[PDB]
Amino acid sequence: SPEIMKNLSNNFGKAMDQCKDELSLPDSVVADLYNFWKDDYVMTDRLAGCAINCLATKLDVVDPDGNLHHGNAKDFAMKHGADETMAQQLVDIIHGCEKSAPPNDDKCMKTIDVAMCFKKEIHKLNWVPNMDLVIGEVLAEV
Secondary structure, three states: OOOOOOOOOOOOHHHHHHHHHHOOOOHHHHHHHOOOOOOOOOOOOHHHHHHHHHHOOOHHHHOOOOOOOOOOOOOOHHHHOOOHHHHHHHHHHHHHHOOOOOOOOOOOOOHHHHHHHHHHHHHOOOOOOOOOOOOOOEOEOO
16 A cells, blocks of 8 residues: 555645646556656646646645745755755756746646646666666666
8 A cells, every 4th residue: 555545644645636636647646646656747648747746736734834935946855855956956957947837827736737747856766777678678777
Protein backbone atom coordinates (compact mmCIF):
# COMPACT_ATOMS: atom_id res chain seq x y z
CA SER A 1 0.00 0.00 0.00
CA PRO A 2 2.22 2.78 -1.36
CA GLU A 3 1.37 6.45 -1.68
CA ILE A 4 -1.17 5.28 -4.22
CA MET A 5 -3.24 4.08 -1.29
CA LYS A 6 -1.88 6.73 1.03
CA ASN A 7 -3.55 10.09 0.51
CA LEU A 8 -3.21 13.14 2.72
CA SER A 9 -6.10 15.24 3.97
CA ASN A 10 -7.78 16.77 0.94
CA ASN A 11 -5.10 19.08 -0.41
CA PHE A 12 -4.32 15.97 -2.41
CA GLY A 13 -7.10 13.42 -2.09
CA LYS A 14 -9.40 16.27 -3.04
CA ALA A 15 -7.24 17.79 -5.74
CA MET A 16 -6.64 14.29 -7.06
CA ASP A 17 -10.32 13.38 -6.95
CA GLN A 18 -11.20 16.79 -8.34
CA CYS A 19 -8.51 16.59 -11.00
CA LYS A 20 -10.00 13.25 -11.97
CA ASP A 21 -13.10 15.31 -12.66
CA GLU A 22 -12.13 18.79 -13.79
CA LEU A 23 -9.45 17.18 -15.92
CA SER A 24 -11.37 13.91 -16.09
CA LEU A 25 -7.86 12.49 -16.19
CA PRO A 26 -6.70 9.30 -14.45
CA ASP A 27 -5.92 9.99 -10.81
CA SER A 28 -3.54 7.09 -11.24
CA VAL A 29 -1.12 8.95 -13.48
CA VAL A 30 -1.10 11.78 -10.97
CA ALA A 31 -0.86 9.30 -8.11
CA ASP A 32 2.36 8.19 -9.76
CA LEU A 33 3.88 11.62 -9.22
CA TYR A 34 3.99 10.70 -5.55
CA ASN A 35 5.68 7.44 -6.48
CA PHE A 36 8.81 8.68 -8.20
CA TRP A 37 8.07 8.84 -11.91
CA LYS A 38 9.06 12.49 -11.81
CA ASP A 39 11.31 11.75 -14.76
CA ASP A 40 8.06 10.96 -16.54
CA TYR A 41 6.83 14.47 -17.29
CA VAL A 42 3.98 15.68 -19.47
CA MET A 43 6.18 14.22 -22.18
CA THR A 44 4.20 11.09 -21.40
CA ASP A 45 1.11 12.18 -19.50
CA ARG A 46 0.42 15.90 -19.39
CA LEU A 47 -2.57 15.16 -17.19
CA ALA A 48 -0.11 14.30 -14.45
CA GLY A 49 1.21 17.81 -14.95
CA CYS A 50 -2.25 19.33 -15.09
CA ALA A 51 -3.55 17.31 -12.17
CA ILE A 52 -0.56 18.36 -10.10
CA ASN A 53 -1.18 21.93 -11.18
CA CYS A 54 -4.76 21.66 -9.98
CA LEU A 55 -3.23 20.26 -6.82
CA ALA A 56 -2.53 23.85 -5.86
CA THR A 57 -6.22 24.41 -6.46
CA LYS A 58 -6.40 25.55 -2.85
CA LEU A 59 -3.22 27.28 -1.75
CA ASP A 60 -4.87 27.61 1.64
CA VAL A 61 -4.31 23.89 2.08
CA VAL A 62 -1.04 23.77 0.19
CA ASP A 63 0.24 26.81 2.06
CA PRO A 64 -1.36 27.70 5.40
CA ASP A 65 1.07 30.50 6.17
CA GLY A 66 2.31 30.71 2.60
CA ASN A 67 4.65 27.74 2.41
CA LEU A 68 4.82 28.44 -1.30
CA HIS A 69 2.80 29.24 -4.40
CA HIS A 70 2.33 26.95 -7.38
CA GLY A 71 4.30 28.19 -10.37
CA ASN A 72 6.14 30.62 -8.12
CA ALA A 73 7.45 28.69 -5.13
CA LYS A 74 8.37 31.03 -2.31
CA ASP A 75 11.94 31.26 -1.08
CA PHE A 76 10.73 28.85 1.58
CA ALA A 77 9.95 25.88 -0.64
CA MET A 78 13.08 26.18 -2.75
CA LYS A 79 15.06 26.57 0.46
CA HIS A 80 13.60 24.42 3.21
CA GLY A 81 14.11 21.60 0.74
CA ALA A 82 16.40 22.91 -1.97
CA ASP A 83 20.09 22.36 -2.62
CA GLU A 84 22.35 25.39 -2.39
CA THR A 85 23.08 24.63 -6.02
CA MET A 86 19.46 24.08 -6.99
CA ALA A 87 18.95 27.65 -5.84
CA GLN A 88 20.70 29.12 -8.86
CA GLN A 89 20.88 25.91 -10.87
CA LEU A 90 17.12 25.81 -11.27
CA VAL A 91 17.43 29.41 -12.40
CA ASP A 92 19.29 27.80 -15.27
CA ILE A 93 16.70 25.44 -16.70
CA ILE A 94 13.89 27.50 -15.23
CA HIS A 95 15.38 30.27 -17.32
CA GLY A 96 15.07 28.12 -20.42
CA CYS A 97 11.68 26.76 -19.43
CA GLU A 98 10.06 29.76 -17.80
CA LYS A 99 11.15 31.59 -20.92
CA SER A 100 9.49 28.93 -23.03
CA ALA A 101 6.63 28.61 -20.57
CA PRO A 102 4.82 31.96 -20.69
CA PRO A 103 1.71 32.87 -18.68
CA ASN A 104 -0.37 31.45 -21.52
CA ASP A 105 -4.02 30.84 -20.77
CA ASP A 106 -3.05 27.20 -21.13
CA LYS A 107 -1.03 27.66 -17.96
CA CYS A 108 -2.28 24.15 -17.32
CA MET A 109 0.13 22.93 -19.97
CA LYS A 110 2.19 26.10 -19.90
CA THR A 111 3.22 26.85 -16.33
CA ILE A 112 3.34 23.11 -15.78
CA ASP A 113 6.17 23.01 -18.29
CA VAL A 114 8.14 24.81 -15.60
CA ALA A 115 6.47 23.14 -12.64
CA MET A 116 7.86 20.03 -14.29
CA CYS A 117 11.05 21.50 -15.70
CA PHE A 118 12.43 21.81 -12.19
CA LYS A 119 10.89 18.46 -11.33
CA LYS A 120 13.38 17.02 -13.79
CA GLU A 121 16.12 18.30 -11.51
CA ILE A 122 14.86 15.78 -8.99
CA HIS A 123 14.69 12.96 -11.50
CA LYS A 124 18.46 13.24 -11.24
CA LEU A 125 18.34 12.81 -7.48
CA ASN A 126 21.02 10.27 -6.65
CA TRP A 127 20.35 7.95 -9.57
CA VAL A 128 20.40 9.21 -13.14
CA PRO A 129 18.84 6.65 -15.48
CA ASN A 130 20.02 8.71 -18.42
CA MET A 131 19.52 5.46 -20.29
CA ASP A 132 16.86 3.07 -19.05
CA LEU A 133 15.32 0.38 -21.22
CA VAL A 134 11.96 1.82 -22.19
CA ILE A 135 11.00 0.08 -25.41
CA GLY A 136 13.89 -2.36 -25.28
CA GLU A 137 15.61 -0.96 -28.35
CA VAL A 138 19.23 -0.17 -29.13
CA LEU A 139 19.79 2.79 -26.85
CA ALA A 140 19.57 1.81 -23.20
CA GLU A 141 21.23 -1.09 -21.41
CA VAL A 142 18.60 -3.70 -22.19
